[PDB]
């Protein structure tokens, strides 16, 4: 990626560097290495009285 000027104003060797958002990557990693995410777990059955069943 090395692209020069089509501007009326300002000429010298202009350079651009590009490091996009990671939430839509689809090629390799998807989050920064500091990121951690734990999942919710679901609400519980109360006490589970025995009620054993014999199939």
């Amino acid at each position: 990626a090395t692209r020069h000027v089509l501007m009326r104003q300002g000429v010298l060797g202009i350079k651009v560097k590009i490091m996009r958002d990671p939430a839509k990557s689809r090629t390799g990693p998807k989050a920064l290495p500091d990121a951690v995410t734990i999942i919710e777990p679901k609400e519980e059955e109360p006490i589970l009285a025995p009620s054993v069943k014999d199939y």
Binding site: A31, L32, P33, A35, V36, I38, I39, P41
Partner: protein, 125 residues
């Protein structure tokens, strides 16, 4: 030469708050657990995160937490006899069934006019 950064410190007590009955004082088991309940990007970061939770978890077997803990909700509700005495410390039976008061405070009860089994002593100064 080795203290743990807050991103280890913070997430170690988030994991202990959502899955506390699932955890275990042995490190080798719950090494296999954090990948299931959470997303860890690297591998060495998982090894450090599960390292200090187990070190945090044996504090629970001696003292209380800086998160939440349902031993407050149940075993401190078993602390409803921290010591309940079988006879009260506020029992007049310890005072031979008669209350020992100062002189002029007896006029307070006589002002509101009640019939209490009290005794009166002498005061200095």
């Amino acid at each position: 030469g080795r203290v743990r950064t807050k991103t280890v410190k913070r997430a170690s007590k988030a994991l202990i708050e959502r899955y506390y009955p699932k955890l275990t004082l042995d490190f080798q088991t719950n090494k296999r657990l954090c990948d299931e309940i959470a997303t860890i990007q690297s591998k060495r970061l998982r090894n450090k995160i599960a390292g200090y939770t187990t070190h945090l978890m044996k504090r629970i077997q001696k003292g209380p937490v800086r998160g939440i803990s349902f031993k407050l909700q149940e075993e401190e509700r078993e602390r409803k006899d921290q010591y309940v005495p079988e006879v009260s410390a506020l029992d007049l039976s310890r005072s031979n069934g008669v209350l020992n008061v100062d002189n002029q405070t007896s006029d307070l009860v006589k002002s509101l006019g009640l019939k209490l089994p009290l005794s009166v002593i002498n005061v200095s100064a």
